[PDB]
Amino acid sequence: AHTLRLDESHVHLVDSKDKFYAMLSDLCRQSMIAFASEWKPTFGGANEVSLIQLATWDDVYMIDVMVSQLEPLDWAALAKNVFNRDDVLKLSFAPSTDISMFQKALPSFNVMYSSQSTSAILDLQLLWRHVERFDSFRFPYHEESVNQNLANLVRLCLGKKLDKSNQFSNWAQRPLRKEQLRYAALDAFCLLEIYDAIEKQLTHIQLDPNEILNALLND
Template sequence: MGYPTMTFEGQITYSRTAVEVEKAAMEVLKTLEAKKNEMDKNAVGFDIEWKPTFKRGVPPGKVAVLQICVDTSCQVMHIIHSGIPQSLQLLLESSSILKVGVGIANDAVKFLKDYNVSIKAVEDLSCLANQKLTEHSKNWGLASLTKKLICKQLLKPKKIQCSNWETNYLSKEQLQYAATDAFASWYLYRLVLRSLPDIEKLEEVTVDNQSEEQAVSCNNFQTAEPLAASL
């Protein structure tokens, strides 16, 4: 049975100049400030894209696109053209804004190498899933995690995934792909994984319950024995 497709149907804002990206980053900061009383921790879905290389020995391109998603709004920033404006750097380097995604630590390393900006406060959803799910630890991808947790498929068409992210203007298909990935990360963290108990805590509860059941069983046995002896 095929799973329904997960798509982002919220608002996508595309920015490609320094002024536009600055405005987009300020909008994210403003949204998080307004929501800080609703959430115990400010969190954004985070992902990046870059132009792949198909020649041996040729390194991949710089990070070209940065996606940040909060709730039903996603900012797709074409930073290969804009660079990193002040507000965006502030957002990325903020330790009070959690950035969530799969393989996000590697993304942070690449971003530091490409733009000399240190992305702080990151949460890898693959690692978090291994704390929450009963399976043995595995290297989750965003698509496999989406299927496992919410029974939806996250499409990864190669013609989009491996497209030219350094192009002058992103296509509608590229924008939709980028926004959906960031949204999936935000959704899985905010509405699914965060609320699941850790496996260790769940095992502790199970052990405690088993101990209580055993104690009740022993007590029943002890009260039953004198009654049987008096017959």
């Protein structure tokens, strides 16, 4: 029931090299990006990426890994100019899962996420656990002791249900259905809306969200 507020003309299926570099042109100047990914259903075999979704406040890009035929230089350019930069905040939910799996499925997309350097990648589940401990902190649609998944965080922050009916859809089918593309784009974009809601409530209880952000990106 939550929906993407961006116009459809600002949701981009990246399925060619020209579209990939047009995306990179936008993203390399952003200061905050959210990311998510969709994977082919597996049947005992190796994992394979279907989509990688990158959202800004103004646009959502969905890289079609199956169709685009990107090469090591292309993935290295995305890692260097977006993910492995300390001056760009990346929002994610439990990023270690996707990032570790990328190392085997898309080895040239070599994202650094480790104890030494977070590469400014923020796990929103860690921010959730951190702010839970402030007795004064209240989500705007607060509920008690929900399971710590993204759908519940969306409800707590935005007051709407996250439609997950396409979460386990057939991400290997081409073309993807419009409902699949909509779910994929919103799964990245809602991370920006979640961060904004938490920021506002930390400010409300007289805490500095930027100070908390820096501490989380260093532990």
